[PDB]
Amino acid sequence: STMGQVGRQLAIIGDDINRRYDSEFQTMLQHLQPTAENAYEYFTKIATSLFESGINWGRVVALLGFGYRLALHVYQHG
């Protein structure tokens, strides 16, 4: 009942997050040029730079979404 309603609301929010930042992620990765060799180094150094200005759940999940994109980029260019 209310569980379905919350999940439906999260789908709206989730799609709006995807819509708002997905192409901007891939644009960032197109310029970053990560490879399997540097992917771990890039991700952990980007994380350090990100979190040195602070941490909240939004920053954490932004990094996870970006990391998902970083992985697909590495596979796509492999």
Place this chain on the structure above:
Amino acid sequence: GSSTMGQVGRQLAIIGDDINRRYDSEFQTMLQHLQPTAENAYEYFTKIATSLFESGINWGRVVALLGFGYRLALHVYQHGL
């Protein structure tokens, strides 16, 4: 490219703060209606996730669920006090 690690980190900080700004209060309001507890938190989270992904999945839906679940955990802790 290699010298952009700081720039990318700052850009994700902007995006992360934007996401937190847009939805943190919204999630807390949703949880006030839902009233989760330690005893139903697992059932609530998994039922909400199934309803979420029933219409599809992308990384945005996944991070929305994770952020919501983080706030759910905090709400459960507060109810326990």
